[model samples]
Target: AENPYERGPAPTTSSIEASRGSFATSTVTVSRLAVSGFGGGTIYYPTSTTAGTFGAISIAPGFTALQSSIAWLGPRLASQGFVVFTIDTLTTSDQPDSRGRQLLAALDYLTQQSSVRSRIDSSRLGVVGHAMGGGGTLEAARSRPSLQAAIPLTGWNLTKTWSTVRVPTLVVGAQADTVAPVASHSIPFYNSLPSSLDKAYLELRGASHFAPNSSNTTIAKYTLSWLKRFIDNDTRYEQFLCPIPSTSLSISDYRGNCPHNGXHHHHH
Candidate 1:
């Protein structure tokens, strides 16, 4: 009756959607001078050790953006029990492929050599990014099958087919994004994922490409749930994942294939 990866308190709608989770957090910056295949950035983590090792995730920013463009996520997610890494790409103009490589490098740095390495469960790691960073997010998961989760926020990519990706992924898109329209970007990416893989697509209502760059309740809620569901194997959060938002005001469109393992253990 023990879910080892489960951390923080049992989650609720208000709890999950809140600006911050209950866990107290601390942050440390990995200077650019620190050894890296990518530019170093900040690491946000739970201060509590009562949960043993927490799952780790590395997040990247879109093209022409710095870590500050997506900085809000670090504290927001880490407070929920994931050791979050918001990184800078090797350069502001790096393409998705290089951004993807940078993200993988950050994950390696986070789990193997970062100051908080011991606090991270290397086996349960994930990747995230916005726009091109999101494109890189897909690439990271494609290259690393072992990653427990992958979330691309309004992600953009030219290489469409992702039938080879085995990692569980949550692809988010903005309804009004011209930069990377859902038509050409998020939808094709989601539609291409192998049917055998656990995957989901979430299209934000009345949003834009910058939606994920800022702190938004809709993004945080599902992002946290997806990570908890796959990374922590916390089935308790599955109730919110199913019956995917067919007609939610905040969600312009949604698609998912749930009952991932078809084995339910209701926690009562």
Candidate 2:
């Protein structure tokens, strides 16, 4: 297929020996990027190919009752040379206050830091979310139209809020996810899109709802590739975006399970 968004120099990521063992750690280390005026949540910065501004808001999987766990994508995204941040959502369950304020906080901090100030490109800054965070991601992007893009990784669509988003977008989901029904969660939200801009949705055949972590390298690779295309100043990673049904699936669709037969492989 053709992708007009493809451009810029290629970027690479590297990781030293993993102290944790069996896990391939992200090349980007998590750290803070200064957005001097903002203070709604803790910030972690990721490596980016360009000294541009980029950020995301994270939603808790359960409810506001539990504090949100740290996201694996925050640092790994940094590995791509973009300043990436994950913030707390405003609502107890996809509340706009937490999600909304966190993005504002991080965006302010990143736009101010001298290390990232001049290189900061508003056209490149954007947000992403998971689960309820998907709803948060839509709110953030809708709020900041100048922010480049928005992605919802395994995000559950609540109240049809994502329909308001007009930026370039990528939506990913797991076929086995029961928490966010594929029919109700991803498909409806995706169909609501106007299709006036770059838009894509991907369904992971066997991956479950929790597959965004590096343990499921397929998820990591595709997510990184999307960010790379928009934020890293590297477009080579574009190939992985908007994947189609595998050839096996193209042949038939009635099977209850992936034909791969209980196996997993990373795209690397």
Candidate 3:
């Protein structure tokens, strides 16, 4: 039950600033992929041929929202040294559990496919989602405990406790969210997580249910930092995540395990 929100050194990367990591990226949207049993998905990865194996992430959108809704996250993360898969659900009405399964299937596809198989380090993988998909991200992480990290944005789920989640997770919430209130969804979800697992909760002020859909710079900054720290195990991003939130007004609250502390919780 330890809250890892202690103040620390400022992260080298600021939310207000736009700095694409070291690599440039390219994207490919596959309309038909049979191996995973999923309908369609988009792959955003670093274009550098020399860039060795990189971590991969599969993202799911909120209920009734198309792949395009969360598509922005793919390239944004890819540019910062991750292989991102923005997938389309079998149906718009699919629940978080179904979406969670679909997220894993997408990662499976990446491992089997030849074009991206060699590029992605399947061992270093993560998942992200928005709204229902955010809840789904938790499901995916719970189902696949081997995942390096999980970040769910303004998620909504029926279950109150996510005791099965073992991966390092970062749950993002919106204060002004009407669809999934912070008290009902995000807070309980964060509290339900066992202290044994490294976790964080970020609340954005005045943000709505669709906060994850748009380019919220704060989300973008932390999303990349979390993946880099947990998925890639890149120590360079440590300062960005462990430190207290910058003076940005967009962030209402932030809490998580500090990287400098003994509980860095390094999971492969």
Candidate 4:
């Protein structure tokens, strides 16, 4: 049985810059700005609109090989009227211990931007990622107060640090993933976060790790629904979080209720 939902956007060999868009594509800047206190750290930001109320900083996934693929999400988000920034995970010519240092450096960049501070909703900022980037966003939300929402796709437990997250977070995983194993990446975080706000652990039953990253309409639909709820303050977006029985898999384990209360978690 061929799973129709297992797929992604048609892969392209676009350069890092191509994945980023300027004011031409949407209202984004598509360029890197250097942040202080972090030597030569660059930020990928789009110009914000007065009508726009929020923005997001998407940390890319796949470590380093699929940077462009991760960057691809930025433009789609920006088109929805949010200022989007994709960071160039800080590294300097064969720098050692670059991974952690570079990702933290992105936070420093976001804090220093007066425009990013003044123009952004401040309270409406969001985060999204895949695998490592997904894991990294959880760490950032745990420690950094600026993040309003965190969505980690196919990214799971990095030592169960979800206890620190204060913002509304969604940990969505594909049932067929081999890379990070959805159970390991999604459930622990849902159970760990102490937040009283809405939080969730959702499953896309028949999809694979790569399927979430690819062009499945279901993945796009569900993820976009979450972002709208978090960033736009759309109350209606809450409907998707209600647990619906999975039609594809007989062994459905989807639970949208809070791990703490065991109620419809996304609804409150």
Candidate 5:
């Protein structure tokens, strides 16, 4: 109800569009990431030769899906100044918790590498996923409370584990999603989270279950803003979340807490 992660007033329509950033991107595939049964995935990062340490994020795809399904986010996030990993699970049918473990293992692998470790701030880590993998994102955050942020996109969680997530989380849902309906999946998951934790919920007007897999401008904007505010502790993106729009006709529901709204904390 409050906006703890604040900036100035909500940007004018043109400002919101003008502030969108564009950056060069690079991609690489790690053929043999030493983790659980099988380990290897793709990594995306900003292409600028300029040296700088950036936050890291690991993304997992939905059940029966591979990294390619959610590949859009890799370059999108990397170009926005993050080292993103889109992982491949040992099996397509892996459950949410298993995928969650794989996500953590990927982070561990990324941080352990001399090359990757040099470019990323391992201490500021985040997790993201779609569908079952979205549920996995929550599982990872719950298991590792120290995670800087977690974004579960159209999650299909069938357990109560998400109630324990302490990480700053953004639950994205799709109103038209039949695979993981908002009623049974996203909304309930968001409601289960503790009020003490800084969190937000967004329901796409008429989106389907896979709406988040691709590059949706609104989702991308908010996703980047959330990671920046929480993971990087960069308040520059704060304006994107608040002055809490009183009403929006296109979206079904949306709400957040700005820093001045209360004592909500964005960083640990």
Candidate 6:
């Protein structure tokens, strides 16, 4: 079975929740002084080439946020078999729209200029972020219709309508979030994504806007599933996403157009 996109072994509840995946991970620091468009940050990728070219994802931090805030996602996602670039903005005060553009710049750098370019399949790319950065993820997907996936965690944006976006997106919200309440931020964003598109909304039970800044099992498991399901076109991950797993202690609300039978242009 030559599953070109599938990178690691079969994903289980345990493997997805583990701190690390099957792959050995490595990191490279990108200097902010050298880059154009956005401030630089760190790049994390699997060291082994046996899995071949993996999809790449570039994520941004919210307003007044640091790369260190989103650093945990680096190895956590990379170890599961993808190139993850946790990016820093040109300035801490940068807005979501600006962070969105920076996400694109970071992806461009990852596939075209990063040292790990050889390890990535440029066509398969995605974006993610927290708060305003999460809102930026939405903007990035809207701006770049070609993006494979987008996940906006507790996103904060003034423009609530997002029917123009074509990328598969997972909107994550914190149930108790005061910064960007679910009714205004995540839920509406989920409602505006063309309804027919590959999209979902996840609410972190008793969580806050800052939930995405740290490590959490619910975020890790679903983020992994969404990325693999869309970025890698790995159907094996659909089981976790579809049938819409019943809400548990970690998740308070989950909604999506399930039975994701849509085609991804068949890369083969």
Instruction: Give per-model CA RMSD.
Output: 3.5, 8.4, 6.1, 9.5, 5.4, 4.2
Candidate 4: misplaced stretches above 4 Å?
A: 1-52, 91-104, 107-111, 114-119, 243-253, 258-262, 265-268
Candidate 5 C-alpha lDDT tens digits along 208-246: 987886667667777777887788776666676665434
User: In model 5, where do residues sit more than 4 Å from their true spots?
Assistant: 1-22, 32-39, 49-51, 246-250, 260-268
Residue 250's lDDT within candidate 3 is 88
| Candidate 6: clashing pairs of residues | none
Q: Each prediction's TM-score against the native?
A: 0.96, 0.66, 0.89, 0.68, 0.86, 0.96
* Clash list (residue pairs), candidate 5: 2-257, 2-258, 3-257, 3-258, 3-259, 4-257, 4-258, 4-259, 5-259
- Candidate 4 residue-wise lDDT at 35: 55
Judged by lDDT, which candidate is best?
A: 6
**What is the full ranking by lDDT, best candidate first?**
6, 1, 3, 5, 4, 2
After superposition, candidate 2 runs with Cα above 4 Å error? 1-42, 46-62, 65-70, 90-98, 113-119, 161-164, 242-268
| lDDT, residue 192, model 4 | 77
Put down candidate 3 lDDT per residue, 1-268, tens digits, no spaces: 1212211123464531354555688888777545445657888888876646788898999889898898778767787777888888888999999989988988888877736778887788999999999989999999999999999999999987998789999999998999999989998999889777778888898899998887778889888878877886666667776655643478777776665324422211
Candidates' C-alpha lDDT: 0.89, 0.50, 0.80, 0.53, 0.77, 0.90
Better model by TM-score, 2 or 3?
3
Worst 10 residues of 1 by lDDT: 259-268
Candidate 1: tens digits of C-alpha lDDT, residues 173-253: 999999999999999999899887888888888898889978899999999999999999998889888856564778877
Where is the poorest 10-residue window by lDDT in model 3? 1-10
The TM-score obtained by model 3 is: 0.89
Write the residue-wise lDDT of candidate 4 on 34-113 in tens digits.
45323332234435443444455545454543455555565655544455555554432312123224445554456445
By TM-score, rank the candidates, best first. Answer: 6, 1, 3, 5, 4, 2
lDDT of 1 at 255: 83
- lDDT score, candidate 2, position 88: 43
Clashing pairs in 3: none
C-alpha lDDT of candidate 5 relative to the true structure: 0.77
Model 6 spans > 4 angstroms off: 263-268
